[PDB]
């Protein structure tokens, strides 16, 4: 409704400072070419769902990059703030260590090519990106302020836009690895159906 | 974000012809006011993630009006095409008999109007819209069409909004029932945030 | 009054999916240069005057193909619908096997190119149009959706325009192979109306 | 599909002078309530088709008043020519005695909002449009000069919409009076195709 | 007040078929370059100013063409009918046979050019315009429709024009062939003055 | 066709400082309502063709008021200029005593109103203009500058209007008082063709 | 408020038609590089005020040439008006023989770009112009219609510009030949200011 | 012809802080309703030619004074700036005491709506306005920056309008008190013109 | 001079949650009518300049509050960063306790409105603002960002506006209490001028 | 909010004439690169704040100069006033001998450029603004007319801004020369931080 992201087409560029490894630094998304990205919006440091969002992300980072998908978070917050909110014990509400990049939205241009500015609040919708190795946007998935997202969810959706990307089946609702797939023409997908009804 | 579709604005309004217990019925937003909606558009009838996408919200469709959630499924496809893959048996690629309405959008207003209409084609990508009591859009989900969409995850979220609406607690990354939820302000989220970590 | 469709210039350009011996196949206006062509649209698969109208040019199609034109019947349903309904038997309001190919025209763009869209429903109304081998749109047919065409007049109307082609007499009223027709001039035409008066 | 044509709406209104019984009277849309309209346009008066097409209407214009529908005939020429016309036996090419009204469109007024003038010529393409009792347009042929239409087929369509009028059955392709229709729903269409397949 | 008609300035150009000698033939602007060209727009065929105007100037067409002028009358009728009525006889309101051209502007370009065209009717003016050998207009004369023109004045005016074309003396109120002419210089007009006063 | 000119149309409005019997007065169009008026306009004061036709006028002056006809001449020079060239004897090139209205339209608001305005030398044609009693405009006439008009022609047509709008006939080419007219309908107007051919 | 004269810049230019020594000649700005001109406006020809400025700029023409100054009258009257003034004695309003040019602004495009045309009127203001050698407006003065202009202050203010042209000195109030000037710097004028007061 | 400042029409109104026998007052073009104005634009305090101007009308204010009018001068300076020039001796380029008020004008209003602004420096040209009792512009009077004004001339045309104001005569060129005027008709000014010439 | 700042105007409305004693409340310009306000912007939580410039206020903030002035810090972090920053200790550089508001500029709004948004950033300039108790913005102060402000400078100017709102005296040059003043008008002045120089 | 002052940007160009040790001389923004610019306006000569303020900084003009900042004055009077304004004793209000430039703004072009023009009066605020050897503006500083500036912020501004031009670190509010500067990063700002709290 607003902004420029359009699934199946090159997702909006993206350029910002971040915290990487409690030290800043710039962030392309030319930088993962050949790789998925999911890069995800929260409103606030400082907040409430947010931490625990970014929290999980960042426990469940490792099992992304197995996949060869990275993953990261952006807020209209500056990388001093991140930083600070870093530098802040999770028991106190803080982040702790953090294992994802951290970017920095303070222009709100990342915001605004997305689609998720709250205008009238001037931060981030809990808008969450799915962009594979060729650049190409390919989910999108956005939540009112109050609900947190779901990293399990996440992680179902990249490792189905690669097995669909790599073997030319599609996934069916609720596919998870291992689950049956379907050849997408008239008289193959029976093999599926057949079986499954 | 998308088309007319805004997280915390009234959803887009719709009328449109279904295909309600194998009879055709009109269906309007309108008619679901003080109930949750989950709204989720496909491309196209006679497919292959298509199918297994309405058959699992059919078979779930009782555990969404268990909550006060009622499903409606969406395509361009007109009513007479819904009713021959309802007619259709599941074990061929049909729908069989179902228990959500299929409403039928041939002059593609209720795709421009969310947003979902992938133009080149002129069918609806696989777009889920959760809409409150209220009639104001809560949650944007949307797929590209190889990847079909997440029933569980559908309904953790309607369970998730609903908790926040009636508690005015947030729900933090993966709430499901039975999980913590965070009191919004600096005091009160101390609790959550010292029992967590 | 909407549309491109205009007597005595080049008939708009299509490009089309179609069913084509049960199988998809890219179909376009250019494939038939030096063809006559009968382009027919009908409002919607699985239901009751189109049907009559598919079977009927799909019967008669060789009658067509010995003057060296081809009928292409088109409305807005997908392949695959057009697929199940072929897939239908006859006897229960489907297509059976077919002898002309079937356009799926899912975007639209034809039948508002040809100025045949039913706006307000999203359908195409019952319009046919011949065109020449040279590209140029000689016959403009529009019905409301109660009532079929006929497959006669259309293979006369074929047959006139080949006529007044090669011979360049005109076909007065009511002509029919065999029928007198005149040349068009006032001192040679005297021997038509002299003659038939 | 012609200037203001647009079938299922009101037809274009007109007023024109018209010969009748041999002496000018002005003709007007509204005169025709609750009665059928055939409107014909052809292009020039002291042409080929045109006399043949406008005796085959008059001979069988009570085979259309016997239904009640009125034929009228128009073209941009003046009444002082279609009179002079009239009055040239139908031996050299003139009318002869008619039993339709012939209208003036000198202003190209009628033309224009039918949507069938050729505009390089100033004269109308061979059009004709069926209306019914309540002013709205059903149909819709257009032929290129040099072939005239039938009129078996206007009487057929004349017949197959008053049938469908008064019924609400529809008509499939080529029916005549004594044919078969079918019920427009599913189950009842059942009936037909059973029986004609 | 509409159109392109500007004395001092380049006519209007035209071109028409026209019946010349009971023929069909093009005429244009260009064919009369070093000649005089009276131009005159008359209504209607058959009619009742009309005939007698075109008889009057085919009358004494010789007149002008003994003075290098060439007469053309035209009317937005078709050359169809100028034809016919050219083959009326004079006793019954016909033409007879002519010796002037009779151009068919059924376009209405040469009327709309010349801006004689009487919108309501859609029909021309009664203007006759005067255009000299290098094709500039001298002289505009447009009568209501009621009141004929006098081809005695047109003669007079062409006389006229080619005389102070050639001689370079201008020509006073109501000059025919022999009368006294003015030097159009202060000092020699006074020979002409001092002899009429 | 002038500027503002519109056969058939009320003639362009104006108002004038004139000379009248050698003094100032205020002419306009209004003054004439119930009358003729014949309204001519000429290029330059102290010029050649001009006097001709203001003395040819004003000399028929009496001939135009016994038909309830007001001649009215106007240029662009100012009153002060006409009142000079009044008192200018006519053998000297001047007007002498003046029995006509001589407007002046130094603004040249007339000249532009009706069309006439030779715009890169600021003067007017010699355009005539005929002005029925309801100030409707029947007739223009208009030479370039060498040519003068003619008053027998200017009376002509003033008869001719007059004779048409008071009995209803039309006149023929070259009517004169005491001459034929016709009745301008089919039936009535075969009087004047049979007699006069 | 209106046109082009602008102090400081190039005046307007102008080209024109005038009487010079009683005959016609092109009159054009460019004819006077090098030379002082004072060009004045008057509004009519055979009128009060005008003839005394004329004449009282033409009698002291030459003091004007001997500084190399050319004066120059204009009104919107024609060439033929001006000498029929001229050919008028003063005795009787007229302006006798002169020793000036009086331009003819019938297009009034000299008063337009001047500035000086009274539009209600269609007449020229009595607004005076000095132009300098290079060009460039110096002066400009304007009355309203009662009251003339002097000689002698244009006379003054010619030679006032030429003085300052030549010397660089500024001219005080009352300046003439003979006067002092002033230096036009803070140090050199303290001589002027010291020793007159 | 300056900006706002149109000859025959109100004068632009103006209101401005003023010194006035050495204190600020504020001076508005209303104060002088029924009194002449004579209205001098200067462009720069502490310069040259300017403050002979304002000398010399000042010495003169009571000459024009006892004719009614009000002599008023106004440049782009402040209040405070001419009051510092008022204090400064005339013998060192001041103004010594006036007997006039000097207007302010420093948002460059006055001058911008008098038209006399010189845009490039900022500055008011030399330019002199006259208006009468009655508001209504009758002189425009405007230098180049090197040339003084007459104060002599500003009187003569002040005498001179009051004098046509009040008698309705005109006044020929260099008219001054005890010339004789004309009376502005064709009949009285001979009166003048016979014995003047 | 920034955005809608403009001295001499009321100020910018505004409207913020803020930090005021480790609490969040809103604050809004209405709540200082009859106070003195100054509202400072600064770039970013957590740097470097900012903080020493929050706390110097801070620590002066009952200087100013004894005079009637209110300060007010402002940037576009939000209320949760700002309280985190003010939870920080000064020696690891945050802000200790505050005894002033500190406004969440989250919309940008504020710095849009005074003027004050480095766009390419999106953060706020160290904008200073001083707003008088009837609304009225009075001073504008802007540092480039590696520039910290004077909190004595912002004093000074505090009590130098309140100063000349109570006296009507202006203030020199470096006034601080105690200093002389200046009586604004030109006799009055001198007492200081004399005194001081 | 308005002009083009913008920090960070190059400051907007200026070219005036100025006064300059007694003479007249252009002055221009290129003249000062390499050096720090501090440009100040006022609204008006012989007035009582300004005066104070151009002293103030001439005195201490060489202060500036020693650090390679040249200070420039600018109002809207002319070089005529200013140098008047300079030869006025101190002790009456006036500016005596000057150590700084005085420009001169007549045409308002710096005043607009700067956006420092109070519109209302046509005066420029008292604006300050600090430019560096780059051409890059610096600071703003605008004051309400009745309160002076402070020359030694003004220097300690300038100082600030050298200072971290050549070190790169940051200076705290209130910089003095010989203050503690930050280092502008997370870490190395620690040494400030903990050594003043």
Known sequence: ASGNARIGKPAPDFKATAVVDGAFKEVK?????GKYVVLFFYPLDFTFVCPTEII??????????????E???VSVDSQFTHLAWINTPRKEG?????????????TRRLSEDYGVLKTDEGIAYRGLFIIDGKGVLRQITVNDLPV?????????????????????????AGWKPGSDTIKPNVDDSKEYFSKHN
Do not use: M, W
Not at 29 to 33: A, P, V
Not at 56 to 69: I, M, T
Not at 96 to 105: F, K, T, V, Y
């Open 56 to 69: 999980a992300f960042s426990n469940r980072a490792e099992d992304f990059r197995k996949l060869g998908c």
């Open 71 to 73: 993953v990261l978070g």
């Open 29 to 33: 998304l030319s930088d993962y070419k």
């Open 148 to 172: 947190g997202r779901s990293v399990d969810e996440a992680l179902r959706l990249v490792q189905a836009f690669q097995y669909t990307d790599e073997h030319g089946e599609v996934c069916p």
């Open 94 to 106: 803080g982040l702790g260590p953090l294992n994802i990049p951290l970017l920095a939205d303070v």
